[PDB]
Amino acid sequence: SDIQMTQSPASLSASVGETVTITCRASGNIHNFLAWYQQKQGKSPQVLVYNAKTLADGVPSRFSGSGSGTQYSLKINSLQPEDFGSYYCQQFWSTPYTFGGGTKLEIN
Amino acid sequence: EVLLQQSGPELVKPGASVRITCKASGYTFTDFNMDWVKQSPGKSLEWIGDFNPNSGGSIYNQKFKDKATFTVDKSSSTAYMELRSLTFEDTAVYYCARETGTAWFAYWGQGTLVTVSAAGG
Amino acid sequence: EFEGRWRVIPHDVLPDWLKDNDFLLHGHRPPMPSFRACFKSIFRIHTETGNIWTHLLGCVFFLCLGIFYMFRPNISFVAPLQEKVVFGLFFLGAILCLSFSWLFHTVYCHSEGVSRLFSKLDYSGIALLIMGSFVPWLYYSFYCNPQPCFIYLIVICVLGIAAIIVSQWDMFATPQYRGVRAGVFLGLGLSGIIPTLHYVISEGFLKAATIGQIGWLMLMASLYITGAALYAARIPERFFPGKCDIWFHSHQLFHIFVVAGAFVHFHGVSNLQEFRFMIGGGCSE
Ligand SMILES: CCCCCCCC/C=C/CCCCCCCC(=O)OC[C@@H](O)CO
Ligand SMILES: CCCCCCCC/C=C\CCCCCCCC(=O)OC[C@@H](O)CO
Ligand SMILES: CCCCCCCC/C=C\CCCCCCCC(=O)OC[C@@H](O)CO
Ligand SMILES: CCCCCCCC/C=C\CCCCCCCC(=O)OC[C@@H](O)CO
Ligand SMILES: CCCCCCCC/C=C\CCCCCCCC(=O)OC[C@@H](O)CO
Ligand SMILES: CCCCCCCC/C=C\CCCCCCCC(=O)O
Ligand SMILES: [Zn+2]
């Protein structure tokens, strides 16, 4: 139970077209070995951004990963209706791998 | 395309054991580590452990060392996770998630819901 | 250790900025944006282990050879200050080339930006080794004629700086430009044919051969051609794809030809200095 991942905000609701920012803080340096996942209702999670800033195959350019050391960020530019769901950060720098508590994002 | 296909849901009694199947296709099975993830209802994700199909080695998160056991059947390209001495806290969706060199997860199973219920005795 | 754990990956799952040789099928380091992980990976087996250690050991070897060259007794030279500056310029080219080389191969898998930065330094390192090798060579060969010595010193610098400029261009690093890179660095080394013909036209056929330069320069030209041929055609992994992922692939053999080529060049110019010391520092002929 070594590296604690702190996601913020826990939840938020924004309108389509706006920009949101989810932050993650690690209890120890994770050397950019961070990933973000989006999870839809009743569905399995899907990788958005990996290695802190690398945008995964198939993911829109609206998603952008940023940060270093212990402070990472996920920015969703121009929100779309399909962006509702739970967002999770994850560290793969040290075992055991840990996830953030998640961020519930509602779209108005 | 890569696909991770898990076995169907389980509704079991407390103290029972379950084996979650993870059929892996669309790639060379032994090339990547397979990880197991738990998600308790309305909760975040918890890494249970990782498994190396080439070496056969496993690394478990201490929290689940006495609960989960990872096995493999390389010839059939499938990962397994056996859950021991089931309890109401073990009611969760369990996922297999595949690594790509490092433990970020590009590929995920659909999830197996395991329900520990004492409704029938 | 539990930190920065990784497994090798096949070629197909690599990002585009890492897919440079499709005949190295497995054993690749995955993208890992940690200098701690990249430097720790020097102690791991992957496509880049041999590339890293050939030039890591070669780098400490020329550094040790250069320190010992500087502390050689001044009594064993004709002009110890200018002789050590011309050898030192060669050592500076060799050490920088091998340092930029093993650093690039170590931090290559870090990120796209880091790999772009160190590939530009890696390429530039080959131009510095080539320009720097001309300096003691022109020095001893045109020991009596200063004007052609200085003209050739200019030429190799103008050409070398042009290779450093072109090796800054993003298209130059793409796998399709592999033979362009091989031709650019090959032309740079093989441009020594000009001061060679000037030297044999002036000094004589007997004079150039007897003093071992002709044979030694044919060996150097062979290592240049043979080294550029393996590198450009990806031999032998082109013939045995998947068998040369870790040992003896083209880039690995090329790395060996760079440290060997720099050692036969050093041995050559080091004999030229022994000969100059045997005859003294004037002109009677
Ligand atoms: C060129 C002369 C010889 C050089 C010696 C090689 C240096 C030896 C070790 C190098 C690695 C040191 C660790 C370098 C940094 C570790 C990974 C990283 O990027 O973490 C920084 C975080 O704050 C960002 O998330
Ligand atoms: C990976 C290879 C690393 C091994 C070391 C490198 C090989 C040795 C290189 C050169 C040795 C030539 C020795 C002869 C040249 C030095 C002459 C001298 O008088 O030097 C004084 C010294 O006390 C200065 O410290
Ligand atoms: C006394 C004569 C000169 C001797 C000293 C020479 C030392 C080596 C100098 C230069 C080496 C070539 C430098 C070439 C330039 C460095 C790479 C670069 O431009 O990177 C930019 C990045 O943002 C791209 O990602
Ligand atoms: C690392 C740089 C080393 C110096 C530059 C090397 C560039 C290659 C230059 C020339 C090619 C090889 C030598 C070519 C030599 C040309 C003269 C010749 O044909 O002599 C034949 C004799 O039998 C007549 O007596
Ligand atoms: C005197 C000969 C010594 C060997 C010199 C070798 C370097 C020059 C050779 C060829 C230059 C080709 C220029 C054209 C390069 C075309 C690039 C290409 O299509 O590459 C295909 C891949 O399979 C390989 O990258
Ligand atoms: C002292 C001279 C050393 C000569 C030995 C090597 C001969 C090969 C020379 C030039 C061709 C180089 C082509 C490869 C370019 C880039 C390779 C790399 O990134 O390491
Ligand atoms: Zn190299």
Side-chain angles (χ1 to χ4, degrees):
Chain A
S1 42
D2 216 46
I3 299 196
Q4 245 84 356
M5 294 300 260
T6 300
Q7 226 174 307
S8 193
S11 70
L12 87 161
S13 88
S15 308
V16 154
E18 284 164 8
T19 287
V20 304
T21 309
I22 297 157
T23 75
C24 165
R25 184 210 325 122
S27 78
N29 198 308
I30 60 173
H31 302 71
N32 308 303
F33 281 40
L34 175 114
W36 294 93
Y37 298 92
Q38 180 200 58
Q39 196 186 20
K40 300 290 236 307
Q41 286 54 220
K43 303 199 268 155
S44 144
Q46 83 161 233
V47 70
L48 303 156
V49 174
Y50 66 93
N51 281 339
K53 305 163 161 168
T54 299
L55 193 60
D57 286 24
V59 184
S61 36
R62 312 185 282 104
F63 296 92
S64 32
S66 107
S68 78
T70 56
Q71 258 124 33
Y72 301 83
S73 248
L74 181 66
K75 183 196 212 200
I76 313 159
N77 297 279
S78 179
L79 277 172
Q80 298 299 300
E82 67 267 16
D83 298 339
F84 73 122
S86 285
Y87 289 80
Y88 293 96
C89 51
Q90 184 238 337
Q91 66 89 18
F92 46 101
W93 176 257
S94 62
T95 64
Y97 304 140
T98 52
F99 289 86
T103 300
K104 247 229 159 165
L105 170 64
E106 286 178 273
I107 311 287
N108 327 315
Chain B
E1 46 155 334
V2 170
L3 252 127
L4 300 187
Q5 284 176 87
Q6 302 180 234
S7 46
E10 312 249 17
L11 219 191
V12 307
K13 279 133 51 74
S17 282
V18 288
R19 179 145 46 116
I20 300 165
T21 265
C22 169
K23 212 264 158 113
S25 93
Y27 75 99
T28 292
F29 185 54
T30 57
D31 283 349
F32 307 99
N33 285 356
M34 193 70 77
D35 294 40
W36 292 92
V37 167
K38 170 191 193 157
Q39 187 168 23
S40 287
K43 292 283 267 176
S44 187
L45 302 159
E46 295 173 286
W47 183 72
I48 301 170
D50 71 270
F51 181 76
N52 186 320
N54 179 315
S55 93
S58 326
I59 301 293
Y60 303 86
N61 165 340
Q62 291 179 37
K63 168 157 196 193
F64 306 99
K65 70 186 200 47
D66 295 351
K67 171 71 55 179
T69 299
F70 310 149
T71 45
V72 84
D73 174 355
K74 314 199 206 188
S75 64
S76 76
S77 251
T78 98
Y80 304 99
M81 186 187 54
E82 190 191 39
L83 274 359
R84 228 127 82 238
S85 176
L86 294 164
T87 287
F88 298 131
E89 329 175 331
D90 307 334
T91 289
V93 173
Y94 296 90
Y95 293 103
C96 60
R98 201 209 86 192
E99 308 188 25
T100 313
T102 52
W104 58 267
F105 307 123
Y107 304 103
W108 290 73
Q110 87 288 1
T112 303
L113 166 66
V114 173
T115 310
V116 182
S117 170
Chain C
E1 190 74 79
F2 284 160
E3 272 198 343
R5 310 168 62 211
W6 57 274
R7 282 188 64 199
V8 297
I9 60 170
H11 194 267
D12 64 287
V13 307
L14 283 158
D16 294 342
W17 51 275
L18 282 187
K19 297 214 250 278
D20 84 278
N21 186 2
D22 41 305
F23 303 143
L24 304 189
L25 301 186
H26 216 307
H28 296 274
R29 276 179 307 176
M32 277 185 297
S34 167
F35 286 109
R36 188 137 358 246
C38 302
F39 276 94
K40 269 207 240 157
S41 86
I42 281 161
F43 299 93
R44 293 272 300 267
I45 317 311
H46 46 81
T47 60
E48 296 281 16
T49 309
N51 291 326
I52 298 167
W53 287 92
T54 50
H55 286 188
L56 164 56
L57 304 149
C59 178
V60 327
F61 174 77
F62 277 101
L63 236 173
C64 295
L65 188 62
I67 307 302
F68 276 63
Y69 209 88
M70 295 315 269
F71 292 86
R72 265 185 55 178
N74 290 320
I75 227 306
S76 62
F77 299 82
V78 162
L81 182 61
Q82 69 187 61
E83 287 177 61
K84 287 177 185 179
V85 165
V86 306
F87 266 86
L89 284 169
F90 164 62
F91 287 117
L92 174 72
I95 289 156
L96 284 170
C97 171
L98 302 164
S99 290
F100 293 153
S101 189
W102 76 265
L103 289 167
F104 157 71
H105 286 273
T106 294
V107 310
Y108 181 39
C109 59
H110 186 278
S111 45
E112 182 169 85
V114 165
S115 105
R116 292 291 69 74
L117 201 209
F118 289 77
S119 62
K120 287 175 210 293
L121 293 168
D122 184 42
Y123 292 154
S124 291
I126 308 177
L128 298 168
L129 164 68
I130 293 161
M131 293 159 73
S133 69
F134 272 53
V135 179
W137 183 58
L138 293 172
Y139 180 75
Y140 288 105
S141 288
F142 296 102
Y143 193 91
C144 292
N145 323 337
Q147 193 209 320
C149 184
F150 275 119
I151 298 302
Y152 292 126
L153 233 174
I154 309 302
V155 171
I156 199 64
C157 287
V158 172
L159 284 166
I161 287 177
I164 283 157
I165 298 156
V166 69
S167 82
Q168 237 46 55
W169 179 34
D170 276 6
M171 277 299 102
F172 197 75
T174 76
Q176 315 87 41
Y177 275 69
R178 213 191 309 279
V180 182
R181 298 205 302 273
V184 174
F185 297 114
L186 191 57
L188 198 57
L190 296 191
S191 68
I193 194 52
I194 304 306
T196 296
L197 275 7
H198 189 137
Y199 175 79
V200 68
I201 287 177
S202 275
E203 282 250 69
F205 276 162
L206 161 80
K207 281 56 79 274
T210 57
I211 73 133
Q213 280 232 53
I214 293 179
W216 167 69
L217 296 157
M218 278 159 92
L219 173 56
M220 286 305 309
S222 284
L223 302 154
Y224 265 108
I225 296 295
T226 311
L230 294 175
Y231 177 92
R234 302 131 86 193
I235 291 155
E237 72 272 22
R238 160 176 301 287
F239 307 132
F240 323 91
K243 284 258 111 150
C244 305
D245 299 344
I246 314 297
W247 307 105
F248 309 115
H249 59 247
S250 86
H251 203 116
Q252 193 165 118
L253 303 174
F254 172 65
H255 269 213
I256 286 144
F257 271 80
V258 171
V259 338
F263 196 69
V264 3
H265 180 83
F266 169 72
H267 196 256
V269 299
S270 166
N271 285 345
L272 293 172
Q273 99 87 29
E274 280 174 303
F275 181 71
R276 234 301 123 23
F277 178 67
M278 282 332 124
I279 74 168
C283 193
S284 68
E285 23 93 296

